[PDB]
Amino acid sequence: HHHHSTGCTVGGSTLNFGKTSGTWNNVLTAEVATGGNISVTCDGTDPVDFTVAIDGGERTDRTLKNTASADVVAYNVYRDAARTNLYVVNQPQQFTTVSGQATAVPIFGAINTPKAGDYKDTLLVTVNF
């Protein structure tokens, strides 16, 4: 037949926080769990284990940048909405697929000397089988 060569459809199939200028004085929430979110779908009868790791941004410390300035503001992303499970930088978290259902890769985000218009960063999301 022979054996089943498994094949998967990996995501996606951004995190807009709003404004980080001036003062907020509480933690900012943004979610991708937006253009759709990320999910792995495999096709065996067996489940497939896989692994997702998130880097530390363009500066390795998960810090945005204003673009106009050296103004930087730090952040972190989490697997659960409750933010108990940190996507610790470059450390993989285990996932599994159930036969015939998509597994979401959720990413929940969070974040005073006020800084004042538009800040940016880019995260590397590695999915490993």
């Binding site: 054996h3 199939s13 709003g18 497939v48 999301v125």
Partner: protein, 229 residues
């Protein structure tokens, strides 16, 4: 952007000069991707990747329009050492073309074989491995504490082939012990790895002598005996 990768578990047999991985953009938007293969080892009980020339991926860069299916040719430059299994990752990097945005990277394992050993996923290699006593994973375990006090499980593979572990059981009929945090799974051939385990599992473990891992490295999922060091 959205990709169908097949096969997720590619191998190059001893007597093949290449294999193919298929990459299909199933999104509605054009995508651009970089293709690389890294040699893969577990020296120092951590996973390490190095650039490498034993396997050459073709094309190294590709525009994949929506709906199109491209054939990655993974080529074995020279014959590999006798009776050994070599470990790689194919890395597929999606190139881009107050916010924070995501760049995706997809990594599948690749395994190539030298004379006298094979994946075991075809009848030709199955018959080849029956003649090799160590053409399989041959695992040992022992749990040891750090000076900081963290508990960590050591898995050591004596066999010429890797093991992909989904779970650890304490008996052939038991249930999976709750490996809490920290991913684990691959113990490559002729290596040993080291997972961080919570306290709930040390004790549960090491109240038993043999344990059993669920292994997908071959055709079907199967228990394997892990003995104590």
């Amino acid at each position: 952007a959205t990709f169908l990768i097949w096969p997720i578990y590619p191998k190059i047999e001893a007597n093949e000069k290449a294999t193919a991985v298929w990459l299909q953009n199933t999104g509605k938007t054009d995508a651009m991707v970089q293709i690389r293969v890294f040699k893969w080892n577990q020296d120092g009980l951590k996973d390490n990747y190095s650039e490498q020339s034993e396997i050459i991926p073709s094309p190294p860069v590709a525009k994949i329009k929506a709906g199109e299916k491209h054939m990655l040719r993974l080529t074995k430059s020279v014959n590999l050492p006798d009776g050994k299994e070599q470990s790689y990752r194919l890395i597929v990097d999606e190139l881009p073309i107050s916010k924070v945005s995501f760049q995706m990277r997809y990594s599948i394992p690749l395994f190539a074989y030298g004379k006298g050993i094979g994946s075991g996923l075809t009848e030709e290699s199955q018959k080849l491995n029956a003649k090799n006593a160590l053409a399989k994973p041959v695992l040992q375990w022992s749990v040891r504490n750090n000076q900081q006090g963290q508990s960590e499980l050591y898995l050591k593979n004596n066999g010429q082939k890797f093991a992909r572990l989904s779970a650890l059981k304490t008996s052939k009929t038991g249930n999976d012990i709750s490996l809490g945090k920290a991913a684990f799974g691959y113990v490559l051939s002729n290596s040993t790895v080291k997972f961080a385990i919570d306290q709930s599992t040390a004790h549960e473990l090491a109240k038993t002598s043999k344990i059993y891992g669920v292994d997908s490295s071959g055709i079907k999922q199967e228990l394997i005996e892990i003995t104590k060091m």
